[PDB]
Amino acid sequence: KTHVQLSLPVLQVRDVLVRGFGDSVEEVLSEARQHLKDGTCGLVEVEKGVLPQLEQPYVFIKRSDAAPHGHVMVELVAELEGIQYGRSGETLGVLVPHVGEIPVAYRKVLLRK
């Protein structure tokens, strides 16, 4: 399928133990997609002070369109030293590995895969 319904655990930035997916734009997009498939991906909502507490390159979920079955359609965009790889809509948050952190909420998305 081109899209997959997911419910992503929303994590507090200060709880996150593994603060990014790797060391290159291509690696972080690869690992993000792998963790999304394996159900081991979390979401951090972006506010002032969040991104400096995480590791670049960043992987964002961005709104790809205006929301089936209560799931916002999203796609992945990576960022490194202020350059984005991908072009999309509003940021829903930054993706991180999930390794058992307790979430504050869930974000229902339809992920373009």
Q: DSSP assignment, residue 52?
A: G
User: What is the Cα–Cα distance from 70 to 66, expressed in whole angstroms?
Assistant: 12
Which technique was the structure solved with, according to the deposited record? X-ray
Q: DSSP assignment, residue 97?
A: E
Query: Which one is the CATH code of 3-112: 2.30.30, 2.60.290, 1.10.287, 2.60.40?
Result: 2.30.30
User: What is the Cα–Cα distance from 25 to 80, expressed in whole angstroms?
Assistant: 7
CA triplet 13, 107, 26: central angle to 5 degrees? 65
User: What is the Cα–Cα distance from 54 to 8, expressed in whole angstroms?
Assistant: 18
Strands 41-44 and 58-63: unpaired
Resolution (A): 1.6
| Residue 20, CA distances (Å) to 47, 74, 100 in order | 17, 19, 15
Q: Delimit the domains of the chain by residue range.
A: 3-112
Provide the token pair at 88.
């999309």
- First CA to last CA distance, the chain: 8
SS3 call for 32:
helix
